[PDB]
Amino acid sequence: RLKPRSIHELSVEQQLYYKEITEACVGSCEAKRAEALQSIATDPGLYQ
Amino acid sequence: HELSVEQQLYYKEITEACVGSCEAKRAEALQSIATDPGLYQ
Amino acid sequence: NPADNYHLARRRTLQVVVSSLLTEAGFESAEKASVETLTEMLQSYISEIGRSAKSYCEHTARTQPTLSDIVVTLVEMGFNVDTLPAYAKRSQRMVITAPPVTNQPVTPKALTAGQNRPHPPHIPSHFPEFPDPHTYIKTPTYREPVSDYQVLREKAASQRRDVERALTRFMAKTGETQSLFKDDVSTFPLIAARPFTIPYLTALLPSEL
Amino acid sequence: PWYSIFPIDNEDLVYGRWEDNIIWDAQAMPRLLEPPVLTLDPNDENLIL
Protein backbone atom coordinates (compact mmCIF):
# COMPACT_ATOMS: atom_id res chain seq x y z
CA ARG A 1 0.00 0.00 0.00
CA LEU A 2 1.50 3.41 -0.98
CA LYS A 3 -0.24 6.66 0.13
CA PRO A 4 -1.08 8.94 -2.89
CA ARG A 5 1.49 11.45 -4.08
CA SER A 6 0.36 14.71 -2.55
CA ILE A 7 0.21 18.10 -4.22
CA HIS A 8 1.36 21.42 -2.84
CA GLU A 9 -1.44 23.65 -1.59
CA LEU A 10 -0.36 26.44 -3.97
CA SER A 11 -1.07 26.42 -7.69
CA VAL A 12 1.75 26.82 -10.18
CA GLU A 13 0.34 30.24 -11.17
CA GLN A 14 0.36 31.09 -7.43
CA GLN A 15 3.84 29.64 -6.96
CA LEU A 16 5.11 31.55 -10.00
CA TYR A 17 3.42 34.67 -8.61
CA TYR A 18 5.21 34.15 -5.28
CA LYS A 19 8.54 33.74 -7.08
CA GLU A 20 8.02 36.89 -9.18
CA ILE A 21 6.86 38.98 -6.20
CA THR A 22 9.77 37.86 -4.02
CA GLU A 23 12.32 38.40 -6.80
CA ALA A 24 10.84 41.85 -7.41
CA CYS A 25 10.74 42.73 -3.69
CA VAL A 26 14.53 42.30 -3.32
CA GLY A 27 14.68 45.60 -5.17
CA SER A 28 16.79 45.18 -8.29
CA CYS A 29 14.55 47.71 -10.06
CA GLU A 30 12.50 50.33 -8.25
CA ALA A 31 9.34 50.26 -10.40
CA LYS A 32 9.25 46.47 -10.04
CA ARG A 33 9.52 46.83 -6.28
CA ALA A 34 6.81 49.48 -6.09
CA GLU A 35 4.31 47.40 -8.08
CA ALA A 36 5.17 44.27 -6.14
CA LEU A 37 4.62 46.25 -2.93
CA GLN A 38 1.23 47.50 -4.15
CA SER A 39 0.42 43.93 -5.24
CA ILE A 40 1.17 42.74 -1.71
CA ALA A 41 -0.82 45.68 -0.35
CA THR A 42 -4.04 44.83 -2.20
CA ASP A 43 -4.12 41.20 -3.43
CA PRO A 44 -7.27 39.63 -1.94
CA GLY A 45 -6.05 36.08 -2.51
CA LEU A 46 -2.74 36.59 -0.73
CA TYR A 47 -3.92 34.47 2.18
CA GLN A 48 -2.89 30.77 1.99
CA HIS B 1 9.28 -2.30 1.50
CA GLU B 2 10.06 -5.41 3.64
CA LEU B 3 13.13 -4.96 5.92
CA SER B 4 16.27 -6.79 4.64
CA VAL B 5 17.57 -9.52 7.01
CA GLU B 6 20.44 -7.22 8.23
CA GLN B 7 18.06 -4.49 9.43
CA GLN B 8 15.45 -7.04 10.51
CA LEU B 9 18.09 -8.49 12.84
CA TYR B 10 19.11 -4.98 13.93
CA TYR B 11 15.48 -4.12 14.70
CA LYS B 12 15.04 -7.35 16.68
CA GLU B 13 18.21 -6.88 18.75
CA ILE B 14 17.60 -3.19 19.42
CA THR B 15 13.96 -3.67 20.47
CA GLU B 16 14.71 -6.69 22.66
CA ALA B 17 17.60 -4.83 24.28
CA CYS B 18 15.14 -2.22 25.61
CA VAL B 19 12.72 -4.62 27.31
CA GLY B 20 14.67 -5.01 30.53
CA SER B 21 16.96 -8.02 30.74
CA CYS B 22 19.97 -5.92 31.74
CA GLU B 23 20.85 -2.23 31.92
CA ALA B 24 24.19 -2.23 30.06
CA LYS B 25 22.76 -3.67 26.84
CA ARG B 26 19.97 -1.10 27.14
CA ALA B 27 22.46 1.75 27.44
CA GLU B 28 24.39 0.52 24.42
CA ALA B 29 21.15 0.12 22.45
CA LEU B 30 20.08 3.67 23.29
CA GLN B 31 23.55 4.93 22.38
CA SER B 32 23.13 3.05 19.10
CA ILE B 33 19.72 4.64 18.38
CA ALA B 34 21.02 8.10 19.27
CA THR B 35 24.26 7.91 17.25
CA ASP B 36 23.80 5.94 14.04
CA PRO B 37 23.64 7.49 10.55
CA GLY B 38 21.42 5.13 8.59
CA LEU B 39 18.44 4.20 10.79
CA TYR B 40 15.83 5.54 8.32
CA GLN B 41 13.67 2.77 6.75
CA ASN C 1 -19.07 59.80 4.29
CA PRO C 2 -19.51 60.81 0.64
CA ALA C 3 -23.12 59.57 0.52
CA ASP C 4 -24.75 62.32 2.59
CA ASN C 5 -22.14 64.78 1.29
CA TYR C 6 -24.01 64.67 -2.03
CA HIS C 7 -26.86 66.57 -0.34
CA LEU C 8 -24.98 68.38 2.44
CA ALA C 9 -22.48 70.02 0.09
CA ARG C 10 -25.31 72.05 -1.45
CA ARG C 11 -27.62 72.50 1.53
CA ARG C 12 -24.80 73.75 3.75
CA THR C 13 -23.91 76.11 0.91
CA LEU C 14 -27.44 77.47 1.16
CA GLN C 15 -26.87 77.86 4.91
CA VAL C 16 -23.92 80.18 4.24
CA VAL C 17 -26.10 82.08 1.75
CA VAL C 18 -28.87 82.74 4.29
CA SER C 19 -26.22 83.55 6.91
CA SER C 20 -24.77 86.04 4.41
CA LEU C 21 -28.20 87.46 3.56
CA LEU C 22 -29.29 87.90 7.18
CA THR C 23 -26.08 89.83 7.89
CA GLU C 24 -26.54 92.32 5.03
CA ALA C 25 -28.33 95.25 6.73
CA GLY C 26 -29.42 93.02 9.55
CA PHE C 27 -28.65 90.40 12.13
CA GLU C 28 -25.81 88.72 13.90
CA SER C 29 -26.19 85.50 15.96
CA ALA C 30 -29.51 84.14 14.77
CA GLU C 31 -31.51 81.33 16.34
CA LYS C 32 -30.66 77.89 14.99
CA ALA C 33 -34.19 76.82 14.05
CA SER C 34 -34.67 80.16 12.24
CA VAL C 35 -31.73 79.44 9.92
CA GLU C 36 -32.83 75.92 8.93
CA THR C 37 -36.30 77.38 8.39
CA LEU C 38 -35.09 80.09 6.00
CA THR C 39 -32.72 77.82 4.07
CA GLU C 40 -35.60 75.39 3.63
CA MET C 41 -37.67 78.18 2.09
CA LEU C 42 -34.67 78.99 -0.11
CA GLN C 43 -34.26 75.44 -1.44
CA SER C 44 -38.02 75.18 -1.96
CA TYR C 45 -37.91 78.46 -3.90
CA ILE C 46 -35.16 77.42 -6.34
CA SER C 47 -36.93 74.08 -6.80
CA GLU C 48 -40.20 75.90 -7.60
CA ILE C 49 -38.80 78.09 -10.37
CA GLY C 50 -37.19 74.88 -11.60
CA ARG C 51 -40.48 73.01 -11.89
CA SER C 52 -42.64 75.91 -13.06
CA ALA C 53 -40.41 77.55 -15.67
CA LYS C 54 -39.81 74.10 -17.14
CA SER C 55 -43.59 73.66 -17.19
CA TYR C 56 -44.18 77.01 -18.89
CA CYS C 57 -41.63 76.37 -21.64
CA GLU C 58 -42.73 72.77 -22.27
CA HIS C 59 -46.31 74.00 -22.54
CA THR C 60 -45.01 76.08 -25.46
CA ALA C 61 -43.39 72.94 -26.98
CA ARG C 62 -39.83 73.94 -26.01
CA THR C 63 -37.20 72.20 -23.89
CA GLN C 64 -35.00 74.92 -22.44
CA PRO C 65 -36.48 78.05 -20.84
CA THR C 66 -35.86 81.58 -22.07
CA LEU C 67 -36.23 84.86 -20.19
CA SER C 68 -39.92 85.14 -21.13
CA ASP C 69 -40.65 81.86 -19.32
CA ILE C 70 -39.18 83.01 -16.00
CA VAL C 71 -40.72 86.49 -15.99
CA VAL C 72 -44.06 84.70 -16.28
CA THR C 73 -42.96 82.13 -13.66
CA LEU C 74 -41.98 84.83 -11.18
CA VAL C 75 -45.23 86.71 -11.87
CA GLU C 76 -47.17 83.56 -10.95
CA MET C 77 -45.27 83.51 -7.63
CA GLY C 78 -45.88 87.21 -6.95
CA PHE C 79 -42.37 88.62 -7.22
CA ASN C 80 -42.58 92.12 -8.84
CA VAL C 81 -39.62 91.42 -11.14
CA ASP C 82 -38.84 95.12 -11.83
CA THR C 83 -37.28 95.57 -8.36
CA LEU C 84 -34.55 93.00 -9.21
CA PRO C 85 -32.13 95.29 -11.19
CA ALA C 86 -31.92 97.49 -8.08
CA TYR C 87 -31.27 94.52 -5.78
CA ALA C 88 -28.43 93.17 -7.92
CA LYS C 89 -26.41 96.41 -7.71
CA ARG C 90 -26.05 96.55 -3.94
CA SER C 91 -22.79 97.66 -2.31
CA GLN C 92 -23.52 95.05 0.43
CA ARG C 93 -23.77 92.31 -2.26
CA MET C 94 -21.59 89.29 -1.30
CA VAL C 95 -20.50 86.04 -3.05
CA ILE C 96 -20.70 82.69 -1.16
CA THR C 97 -18.03 80.18 -2.36
CA ALA C 98 -19.09 76.87 -4.02
CA PRO C 99 -18.46 73.58 -2.04
CA PRO C 100 -15.13 71.61 -2.28
CA VAL C 101 -14.64 68.43 -4.45
CA THR C 102 -14.21 64.99 -2.76
CA ASN C 103 -11.78 63.67 -5.43
CA GLN C 104 -8.98 66.23 -4.79
CA PRO C 105 -6.23 63.73 -5.97
CA VAL C 106 -8.27 62.75 -9.13
CA THR C 107 -5.62 60.18 -10.26
CA PRO C 108 -3.67 58.85 -7.18
CA LYS C 109 -3.72 55.08 -7.98
CA ALA C 110 -0.55 53.29 -9.24
CA LEU C 111 -2.91 50.27 -9.89
CA THR C 112 -2.11 46.52 -10.21
CA ALA C 113 -1.23 45.44 -13.78
CA GLY C 114 -2.00 41.72 -14.33
CA GLN C 115 -2.98 40.10 -17.67
CA ASN C 116 -3.78 36.40 -18.29
CA ARG C 117 -6.43 34.47 -20.36
CA PRO C 118 -8.30 35.57 -23.56
CA HIS C 119 -11.99 35.63 -24.54
CA PRO C 120 -14.26 32.83 -25.79
CA PRO C 121 -16.10 33.78 -29.01
CA HIS C 122 -19.39 34.53 -27.22
CA ILE C 123 -17.67 37.42 -25.40
CA PRO C 124 -16.66 40.39 -27.60
CA SER C 125 -13.43 42.31 -27.15
CA HIS C 126 -15.01 45.35 -25.47
CA PHE C 127 -15.94 43.47 -22.31
CA PRO C 128 -13.28 43.49 -19.55
CA GLU C 129 -10.41 41.05 -19.81
CA PHE C 130 -10.40 37.79 -17.91
CA PRO C 131 -8.39 38.23 -14.68
CA ASP C 132 -5.12 36.56 -13.56
CA PRO C 133 -4.51 32.81 -12.79
CA HIS C 134 -4.51 33.10 -8.94
CA THR C 135 -8.15 34.28 -9.07
CA TYR C 136 -9.46 30.85 -10.25
CA ILE C 137 -6.68 28.52 -11.59
CA LYS C 138 -5.58 25.41 -9.57
CA THR C 139 -3.07 22.65 -10.60
CA PRO C 140 -1.99 19.96 -8.02
CA THR C 141 1.92 19.83 -8.02
CA TYR C 142 4.10 16.90 -6.79
CA ARG C 143 7.52 16.42 -5.25
CA GLU C 144 10.63 16.07 -7.43
CA PRO C 145 11.17 12.35 -8.15
CA VAL C 146 14.74 11.00 -8.26
CA SER C 147 14.64 8.36 -11.00
CA ASP C 148 18.36 8.15 -11.67
CA TYR C 149 20.07 4.77 -11.75
CA GLN C 150 23.43 6.19 -10.64
CA VAL C 151 22.17 7.87 -7.48
CA LEU C 152 19.84 4.94 -6.71
CA ARG C 153 22.78 2.52 -6.91
CA GLU C 154 24.79 4.90 -4.71
CA LYS C 155 21.97 5.22 -2.14
CA ALA C 156 21.33 1.47 -1.89
CA ALA C 157 25.07 0.73 -1.73
CA SER C 158 25.83 3.29 0.98
CA GLN C 159 22.80 2.30 3.05
CA ARG C 160 23.76 -1.38 2.89
CA ARG C 161 27.38 -0.60 3.82
CA ASP C 162 26.30 1.64 6.71
CA VAL C 163 23.81 -0.84 8.15
CA GLU C 164 26.30 -3.71 7.96
CA ARG C 165 29.00 -1.57 9.57
CA ALA C 166 26.62 -0.55 12.36
CA LEU C 167 25.56 -4.18 12.87
CA THR C 168 29.11 -5.52 13.04
CA ARG C 169 30.32 -2.78 15.39
CA PHE C 170 27.33 -3.39 17.68
CA MET C 171 27.95 -7.14 17.72
CA ALA C 172 31.68 -6.75 18.30
CA LYS C 173 31.14 -4.29 21.15
CA THR C 174 28.58 -6.42 23.04
CA GLY C 175 30.53 -9.67 22.99
CA GLU C 176 33.96 -11.20 23.08
CA THR C 177 36.28 -9.31 20.77
CA GLN C 178 39.64 -9.74 19.09
CA SER C 179 42.03 -7.14 17.65
CA LEU C 180 44.69 -7.76 14.96
CA PHE C 181 46.77 -5.02 16.68
CA LYS C 182 47.18 -4.01 20.37
CA ASP C 183 44.21 -3.01 22.60
CA ASP C 184 42.18 -1.98 19.56
CA VAL C 185 38.46 -2.06 20.26
CA SER C 186 37.28 1.34 18.97
CA THR C 187 38.85 0.99 15.51
CA PHE C 188 38.45 -2.32 13.62
CA PRO C 189 36.77 -4.53 16.25
CA LEU C 190 36.59 -8.21 15.35
CA ILE C 191 33.88 -10.53 16.62
CA ALA C 192 35.75 -13.30 18.39
CA ALA C 193 35.79 -16.87 17.03
CA ARG C 194 33.13 -19.19 18.52
CA PRO C 195 33.78 -22.99 18.21
CA PHE C 196 30.10 -24.02 17.68
CA THR C 197 28.32 -27.35 18.34
CA ILE C 198 26.97 -27.27 14.74
CA PRO C 199 30.09 -27.25 12.41
CA TYR C 200 29.30 -28.52 8.88
CA LEU C 201 25.75 -27.46 9.74
CA THR C 202 26.66 -23.79 9.85
CA ALA C 203 29.06 -24.11 6.92
CA LEU C 204 27.33 -26.16 4.23
CA LEU C 205 23.68 -25.35 4.82
CA PRO C 206 22.03 -22.53 2.85
CA SER C 207 20.30 -19.86 4.88
CA GLU C 208 18.17 -18.12 2.21
CA LEU C 209 16.08 -20.62 0.25
CA PRO D 1 8.81 26.85 -11.39
CA TRP D 2 8.85 23.27 -12.82
CA TYR D 3 8.99 21.85 -9.23
CA SER D 4 8.27 23.32 -5.74
CA ILE D 5 11.36 24.77 -3.91
CA PHE D 6 9.55 23.87 -0.62
CA PRO D 7 9.32 20.06 -0.01
CA ILE D 8 5.73 18.64 -0.08
CA ASP D 9 4.83 18.57 3.65
CA ASN D 10 3.36 15.52 5.44
CA GLU D 11 -0.37 15.84 4.55
CA ASP D 12 -1.26 13.73 7.60
CA LEU D 13 0.64 16.06 10.00
CA VAL D 14 -0.48 19.24 8.21
CA TYR D 15 -4.13 18.12 7.78
CA GLY D 16 -5.05 14.95 9.76
CA ARG D 17 -6.37 15.00 13.32
CA TRP D 18 -3.61 12.90 14.88
CA GLU D 19 -4.91 14.36 18.19
CA ASP D 20 -7.56 11.61 17.87
CA ASN D 21 -4.89 8.94 18.47
CA ILE D 22 -3.96 10.41 21.91
CA ILE D 23 -5.28 8.01 24.64
CA TRP D 24 -6.54 10.37 27.41
CA ASP D 25 -8.13 7.60 29.58
CA ALA D 26 -7.17 3.94 29.08
CA GLN D 27 -10.45 2.49 30.52
CA ALA D 28 -12.92 5.13 29.20
CA MET D 29 -11.40 5.68 25.70
CA PRO D 30 -14.02 7.37 23.43
CA ARG D 31 -13.01 5.94 20.00
CA LEU D 32 -12.33 2.19 19.49
CA LEU D 33 -8.81 2.03 17.93
CA GLU D 34 -7.79 -0.50 15.21
CA PRO D 35 -4.46 -2.16 14.19
CA PRO D 36 -2.55 0.07 11.71
CA VAL D 37 -1.16 -1.39 8.42
CA LEU D 38 2.28 -0.21 7.13
CA THR D 39 1.64 2.29 4.28
CA LEU D 40 5.22 2.95 2.99
CA ASP D 41 4.64 6.56 1.78
CA PRO D 42 6.64 7.05 -1.50
CA ASN D 43 6.63 10.91 -1.22
CA ASP D 44 9.58 10.56 1.22
CA GLU D 45 13.00 10.33 -0.48
CA ASN D 46 15.68 8.01 1.04
CA LEU D 47 13.21 5.11 0.53
CA ILE D 48 14.21 3.02 -2.54
CA LEU D 49 10.52 2.37 -3.41
Side-chain angles (χ1 to χ4, degrees), chain A, chain B, chain C residues 1-103 105-115 118-209, chain D:
Chain A
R1 299 75 191 172
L2 302 180
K3 294 178 181 179
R5 179 89 76 85
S6 88
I7 48 183
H8 200 282
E9 66 270 17
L10 296 184
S11 191
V12 77
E13 142 49 21
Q14 277 179 306
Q15 204 153 345
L16 181 59
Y17 172 80
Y18 166 79
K19 196 191 172 201
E20 295 295 339
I21 287 295
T22 51
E23 287 201 306
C25 278
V26 296
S28 177
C29 181
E30 214 277 333
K32 270 202 153 188
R33 170 136 27 77
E35 162 56 8
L37 258 55
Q38 279 160 126
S39 183
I40 292 172
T42 186
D43 207 317
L46 203 141
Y47 95 102
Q48 192 261 335
Chain B
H1 316 81
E2 303 67 21
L3 278 186
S4 179
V5 47
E6 298 69 357
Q7 42 202 19
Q8 218 161 350
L9 181 58
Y10 182 70
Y11 179 72
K12 183 193 89 72
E13 296 291 322
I14 284 298
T15 50
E16 298 169 353
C18 298
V19 300
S21 77
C22 68
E23 168 65 34
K25 287 179 66 180
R26 143 172 302 128
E28 299 297 326
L30 294 181
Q31 279 159 337
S32 179
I33 293 178
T35 57
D36 291 311
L39 303 195
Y40 341 94
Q41 171 62 224
Chain C
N1 184 29
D4 43 358
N5 277 4
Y6 176 74
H7 303 273
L8 290 179
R10 284 99 164 191
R11 204 183 205 274
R12 284 180 194 171
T13 319
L14 293 189
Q15 270 196 19
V16 189
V17 160
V18 179
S19 298
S20 296
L21 283 176
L22 296 174
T23 42
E24 288 172 29
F27 304 93
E28 316 97 0
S29 192
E31 199 191 332
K32 188 47 174 160
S34 178
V35 175
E36 270 86 7
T37 297
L38 269 184
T39 191
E40 189 214 4
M41 311 218 301
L42 177 62
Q43 171 180 335
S44 177
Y45 206 78
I46 306 167
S47 296
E48 194 37 61
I49 323 173
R51 203 222 44 89
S52 197
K54 179 201 62 61
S55 306
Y56 262 99
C57 74
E58 285 183 350
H59 184 68
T60 64
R62 287 181 277 104
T63 57
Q64 70 216 11
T66 61
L67 181 53
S68 297
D69 291 316
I70 308 189
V71 306
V72 75
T73 304
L74 290 174
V75 153
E76 294 313 302
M77 290 183 217
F79 188 65
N80 193 13
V81 172
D82 186 68
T83 80
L84 208 50
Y87 176 79
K89 310 186 300 183
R90 285 162 306 159
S91 60
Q92 348 152 24
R93 59 152 156 253
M94 291 170 185
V95 173
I96 285 70
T97 179
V101 62
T102 288
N103 199 8
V106 174
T107 45
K109 165 84 292 197
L111 214 56
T112 262
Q115 295 81 32
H119 268 167
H122 60 104
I123 314 186
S125 296
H126 60 86
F127 284 117
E129 213 185 20
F130 277 3
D132 310 12
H134 50 247
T135 61
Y136 48 48
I137 286 309
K138 286 143 298 185
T139 313
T141 230
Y142 283 75
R143 196 50 196 193
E144 189 68 20
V146 281
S147 280
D148 188 20
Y149 186 72
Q150 155 76 37
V151 74
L152 263 291
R153 281 303 297 275
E154 172 65 30
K155 281 312 164 51
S158 67
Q159 285 199 3
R160 180 193 51 84
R161 295 290 303 278
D162 288 330
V163 69
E164 87 185 31
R165 178 202 167 84
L167 176 58
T168 53
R169 295 220 161 217
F170 169 67
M171 206 81 59
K173 269 151 189 163
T174 69
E176 297 316 291
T177 183
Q178 305 201 62
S179 50
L180 322 117
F181 306 88
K182 249 24 104 234
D183 297 334
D184 200 21
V185 175
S186 78
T187 316
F188 313 132
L190 288 173
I191 316 181
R194 22 121 12 183
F196 9 76
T197 72
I198 33 132
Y200 60 81
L201 281 186
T202 186
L204 304 155
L205 273 180
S207 76
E208 292 322 294
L209 78 160
Chain D
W2 190 42
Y3 277 87
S4 181
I5 305 179
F6 304 89
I8 307 180
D9 215 344
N10 207 354
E11 269 177 311
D12 278 302
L13 209 203
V14 177
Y15 298 119
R17 272 199 56 88
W18 40 254
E19 280 239 298
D20 294 355
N21 321 339
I22 303 163
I23 291 182
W24 306 84
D25 177 347
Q27 301 70 221
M29 208 288 177
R31 311 194 179 194
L32 307 187
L33 294 177
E34 296 178 1
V37 205
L38 224 207
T39 17
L40 252 271
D41 180 54
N43 319 354
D44 188 29
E45 285 66 24
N46 300 306
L47 261 61
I48 317 168
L49 33 274

